[PDB]
Amino acid sequence: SGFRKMAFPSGKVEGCMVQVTCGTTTLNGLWLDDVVYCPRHVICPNYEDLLIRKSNHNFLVQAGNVQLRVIGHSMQNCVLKLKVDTANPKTPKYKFVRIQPGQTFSVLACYNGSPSGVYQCAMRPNFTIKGSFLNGSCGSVGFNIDYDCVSFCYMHHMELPTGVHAGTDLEGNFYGPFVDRQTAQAAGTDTTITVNVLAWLYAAVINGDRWFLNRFTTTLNDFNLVAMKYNYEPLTQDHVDILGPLSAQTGIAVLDMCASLKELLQNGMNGRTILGSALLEDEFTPFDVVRQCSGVTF
């Protein structure tokens, strides 16, 4: 029993964190094999022009108390790839994956190439992450672990004026309509990840919280009209299919749980909580609920 916001064990990623310095800018880099990946704003904009003026020795890369020597550099989208002489002996089995909004991942927040914390978060529908980052956190990475393989899905680049964060996948493509530069940028109006709220309601039923259940059902269309009214993301047939296992385990059909969600949106919680929360939680995917309510290890 118990339901916590759980991150993946960060050890495989900790062994990859390095500090990258260029001029007066210090941020984090991800050292995988003989390449260090970091935000291209470390050189700061005309990034081709700024980069051409740099020599290999202008980039100081530090792995613990060991200085790595940069032997090459190239830019791929908004990510700088520093070719180093030494391959990381701690390189885990890894993939670079691009995630979709609603998907969750763990973030190993780092400062000066030293990991300081790990937390779980979701890529919001507005492509921002509600993270916890301070100055020097740039280059901190987001990941999932699938068996023994680390799938790197996010690299921190910046903080928006509302306190939310923006970044890229490990191929340097931003999530969201953001650019890497000091300019007027704002996160779009955010929405609630409906499939994730439903997954969390199934997690509550599994942990013995059933007060929100009712005898009612709904059509997908009627639920989607109600959900659009409350800034909830549309629920697709794919989401319904994905919630199939949880529906079979608890005995509550997805559209039956949708009817519970409609009642909570229309009437609130009435002084009650669900899994110790007075708000509907949307940062647990159906897979996170299954993994935590089954004990999958890495």
Ligand X SMILES: O=C(Cc1cccc(Cl)c1)Nc1cnccc1C(F)(F)F
Binding site for a second copy (CB under 8 A): 1-12, 14-15, 108-112, 114-121, 130-137, 159, 163-165, 207-208, 273, 276-279, 291-298
Q: Which of 22, 38, 41, 156 is catalytic?
A: 41
Total interface residues for ligand X by CB under 6 A? 12
Whether 57 is catalytic is no
Tell me the Cα Rg of the chain.
21
Residue 157 is among the residues annotated as catalytic for this protein: no
Question: Does 103 sit near Cl ion (CB under 5 A)?
Answer: yes
- Closest residue by beta carbon to ligand X: 135
Q: 151, 117, 122: which is closest to 12 by C-alpha?
A: 151
Site residues (CB under 6 A) for ligand X, limited to 24-53: 41
CA distance 243 to 240: 5
- Which residues ranging from 173 to 232 are in contact with ligand X (CB under 6 A)? 180, 182
Closer residue to a second copy (CB): 248 or 296: 296
User: Which residues are registered as beta bridge partners of 12?
Assistant: none
- Which residue lies nearer to ligand X by CB, 67 or 182? 182
Footprint of ligand X on 109-168 (CB under 6 A): 133-135, 137-138, 157-159, 165
Name which of ligand X, a second copy, Cl ion, none residue 243 binds, using a CB cut-off of 5 to 8 Å depending on partner kind. none
Closest CA to 199 of 261, 243, 144, 153: 243
CA dihedral defined by 258, 266, 192, 236, rounded to 10 degrees? 30
| Residue 59 touches which member of Cl ion, a second copy, ligand X, none, C-beta under 5-8 Å by kind | none
Say which entry of Cl ion, ligand X, a second copy, none residue 157 contacts (CB below 5 to 8 A, set by partner kind): ligand X
Torsion of CA 203, 108, 98, 8, to 10 degrees: -40
- The C-alpha atoms of residue 119 and residue 112 are separated, in whole angstroms, by 18
Token output for 151:
């799938």
Q: Specify the residue, 99 or 293, whose C-beta has the smaller distance to Cl ion.
A: 99
Q: Which is nearer to ligand X, 41 or 262 (CB)?
A: 41
* CA 14 vs CA 223, 280, 287: distances in Å: 43, 32, 24
122 binds, among a second copy, Cl ion, ligand X, none (CB under 5 to 8 A by kind): none
C-alpha–C-alpha distance, residues 275 and 3, integer Å = 7
Binding residue for Cl ion (CB under 5 A) from 51, 99, 149, 290? 99
How many Å from the N-terminal Cα to the C-terminal Cα in the chain?
20
Cβ-based nearer residue to ligand X, 137 or 285: 137
Asked whether the beta carbons of 45 and 155 are under 8 A apart, the reply is: no
Please, what sign has the CA dihedral across residues 140, 155, 70, 50?
negative
Question: Where do contacts with Cl ion occur on this chain (CB under 5 A)?
Answer: 99-100, 103
Question: Where do contacts with ligand X occur on this chain (CB under 6 A)?
Answer: 41, 133-135, 137-138, 157-159, 165, 180, 182
Residues annotated as catalytic are 41, 138
